[PDB]
Design an enzyme around this catalytic site. Structure first.
Site, PDB file in Angstrom:
ATOM      1  N   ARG A 198       0.846  -1.190   0.000  1.00 52.95           N
ATOM      2  CA  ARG A 198       0.000   0.000   0.000  1.00 52.95           C
ATOM      3  C   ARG A 198       0.880   1.239   0.000  1.00 52.95           C
ATOM      4  O   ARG A 198       1.368   1.668   1.044  1.00 52.95           O
ATOM      5  CB  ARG A 198      -0.904   0.001   1.237  1.00 52.95           C
ATOM      6  CG  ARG A 198      -1.819   1.211   1.348  1.00 52.95           C
ATOM      7  CD  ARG A 198      -2.788   1.059   2.510  1.00 52.95           C
ATOM      8  NE  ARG A 198      -3.657   2.222   2.664  1.00 52.95           N
ATOM      9  CZ  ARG A 198      -3.276   3.386   3.182  1.00 52.95           C
ATOM     10  NH1 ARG A 198      -2.028   3.554   3.605  1.00 52.95           N
ATOM     11  NH2 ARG A 198      -4.142   4.386   3.278  1.00 52.95           N
ATOM     12  N   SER A 211     -12.871  -3.530   1.355  1.00 53.08           N
ATOM     13  CA  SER A 211     -13.106  -2.801   2.597  1.00 53.08           C
ATOM     14  C   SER A 211     -14.615  -2.597   2.750  1.00 53.08           C
ATOM     15  O   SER A 211     -15.285  -2.132   1.825  1.00 53.08           O
ATOM     16  CB  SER A 211     -12.418  -1.429   2.563  1.00 53.08           C
ATOM     17  OG  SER A 211     -11.021  -1.554   2.370  1.00 53.08           O
ATOM     18  N   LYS A 213      -3.922   6.465   8.455  1.00 53.20           N
ATOM     19  CA  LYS A 213      -4.639   6.685   7.207  1.00 53.20           C
ATOM     20  C   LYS A 213      -5.129   8.134   7.147  1.00 53.20           C
ATOM     21  O   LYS A 213      -4.755   8.889   6.245  1.00 53.20           O
ATOM     22  CB  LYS A 213      -5.821   5.713   7.102  1.00 53.20           C
ATOM     23  CG  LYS A 213      -6.382   5.558   5.696  1.00 53.20           C
ATOM     24  CD  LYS A 213      -7.613   4.667   5.681  1.00 53.20           C
ATOM     25  CE  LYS A 213      -8.268   4.624   4.310  1.00 53.20           C
ATOM     26  NZ  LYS A 213      -9.577   3.910   4.354  1.00 53.20           N
TER      27      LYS A 213
HETATM   28  C1  LIG Z   1      -5.473   1.531   5.596  1.00 55.02           C
HETATM   29  C2  LIG Z   1      -6.516   1.672   6.707  1.00 55.02           C
HETATM   30  N1  LIG Z   1      -7.828   1.550   6.482  1.00 55.02           N
HETATM   31  C3  LIG Z   1      -8.593   1.693   7.565  1.00 55.02           C
HETATM   32  C4  LIG Z   1     -10.115   1.546   7.581  1.00 55.02           C
HETATM   33  O1  LIG Z   1     -10.716   1.810   8.645  1.00 55.02           O
HETATM   34  O2  LIG Z   1     -10.674   1.154   6.534  1.00 55.02           O
HETATM   35  S1  LIG Z   1      -7.616   2.006   8.939  1.00 55.02           S
HETATM   36  C5  LIG Z   1      -6.168   1.926   8.029  1.00 55.02           C
HETATM   37  C6  LIG Z   1      -4.874   2.058   8.517  1.00 55.02           C
HETATM   38  C7  LIG Z   1      -4.519   2.303   9.838  1.00 55.02           C
HETATM   39  O3  LIG Z   1      -3.183   1.860  10.086  1.00 55.02           O
HETATM   40  P1  LIG Z   1      -2.711   1.549  11.592  1.00 55.02           P
HETATM   41  O4  LIG Z   1      -2.619   0.096  11.852  1.00 55.02           O
HETATM   42  O5  LIG Z   1      -1.313   2.315  11.809  1.00 55.02           O
HETATM   43  O6  LIG Z   1      -3.794   2.273  12.538  1.00 55.02           O
HETATM   44  C1  LIG Z   2      -8.447   0.338   3.914  1.00 54.57           C
HETATM   45  C2  LIG Z   2      -8.182  -0.966   4.161  1.00 54.57           C
HETATM   46  C3  LIG Z   2      -9.004  -1.759   5.113  1.00 54.57           C
HETATM   47  N1  LIG Z   2      -8.691  -3.040   5.314  1.00 54.57           N
HETATM   48  C4  LIG Z   2      -7.665  -3.640   4.687  1.00 54.57           C
HETATM   49  C5  LIG Z   2      -7.405  -5.085   4.991  1.00 54.57           C
HETATM   50  F1  LIG Z   2      -7.110  -5.219   6.344  1.00 54.57           F
HETATM   51  F2  LIG Z   2      -6.363  -5.563   4.200  1.00 54.57           F
HETATM   52  F3  LIG Z   2      -8.566  -5.816   4.726  1.00 54.57           F
HETATM   53  N2  LIG Z   2      -6.873  -3.034   3.825  1.00 54.57           N
HETATM   54  C6  LIG Z   2      -7.042  -1.710   3.496  1.00 54.57           C
HETATM   55  N3  LIG Z   2      -6.236  -1.119   2.632  1.00 54.57           N
END
Ligand SMILES: Cc1nc(C(=O)O)sc1CCOP(=O)(O)O
Ligand SMILES: C=C1C=NC(C(F)(F)F)=NC1=N
Length: 219
Positions: A45, A116, A145
């Site tokens: 990503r 997602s 994010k």
């Molecule tokens: C890529 C992404 N998507 C999210 C969602 O809620 O759909 S939260 C997330 C990333 C958060 O990263 P971390 O483990 O550092 O909190």
């Molecule tokens: C926004 C996201 C939410 N969930 C996931 C995963 F955990 F891989 F399913 N990936 C993403 N990039």
């Protein structure tokens, strides 16, 4: 054929997600340490500000995929269907606004498809569209994010399971070694994370602890 439900659930256990901008250390090394520690799946990503572009992005992607191959862990690409196909990735993960899941499923053959989802209807639609797993979140407050929906805890996961929905589910958003357990207990098949590992002083050890913790609660 598509991946089996059973195997998909095993792969989601410790799902590490990372781009070059999620760590101040060497990106490739962080990924290799996460795999050595126990990550069961990895997602490429690369987004946001200062993200790699063009050839530099491809080279990182190729290196990340090589580490995955050597560790025997599947390589998932985020959003980029073309890249996923070009690199012969093991899968692709897409969001709700990014594309048409049904069309992506048709274009990727039997590759792993992740979508997602944030509501009950989205989860059901994802499965109907051909998703092999759904990513639900954010479970806890996140800052990595910074373009997510409101925190939802594990209530949706519990509701999904209560209805009899069996699609593989992975939780994401502010997950740490100390708050992962409740996600598995609520019915998720695993947890996904970025910072908990990418920014850890010891990425290898971090992934190892997650591996042991998830194994314990899935038993
Ligand atoms: C890529 C992404 N998507 C999210 C969602 O809620 O759909 S939260 C997330 C990333 C958060 O990263 P971390 O483990 O550092 O909190
Ligand atoms: C926004 C996201 C939410 N969930 C996931 C995963 F955990 F891989 F399913 N990936 C993403 N990039």
């Amino acid at each position: 054929t598509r991946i089996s439900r059973e195997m998909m659930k095993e792969l989601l256990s410790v799902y590490f997600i990372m781009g070059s901008n999620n760590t101040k250390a060497d990106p490739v090394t962080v990924v290799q340490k996460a795999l050595k520690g126990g990550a069961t799946l990895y997602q490429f990503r690369e987004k946001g500000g200062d993200a790699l572009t063009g050839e530099a992005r491809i080279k990182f992607a190729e290196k990340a995929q090589a580490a995955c191959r050597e560790a025997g862990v599947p390589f998932i690409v985020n959003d980029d269907v073309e890249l996923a196909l070009n690199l012969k990735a093991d899968g692709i993960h897409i969001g709700q606004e990014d594309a048409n899941a049904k069309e992506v499923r048709a274009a990727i053959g039997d590759m792993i498809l992740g979508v997602s989802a944030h509501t009950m209807s989205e989860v059901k639609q994802a499965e109907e569209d051909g998703a092999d797993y759904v990513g639900l979140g954010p479970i806890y407050p996140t800052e990595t994010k910074k373009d997510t929906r409101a925190v939802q805890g594990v209530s949706l996961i519990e509701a999904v399971r209560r209805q009899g929905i069996s699609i593989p589910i992975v939780g994401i958003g502010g997950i740490t070694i100390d708050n992962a357990a409740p996600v598995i207990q609520a019915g998720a098949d695993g947890v996904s994370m970025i910072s908990a590992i990418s920014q850890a002083e010891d990425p290898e050890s971090a992934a190892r602890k997650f591996r042991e913790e998830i194994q314990t609660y899935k038993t």
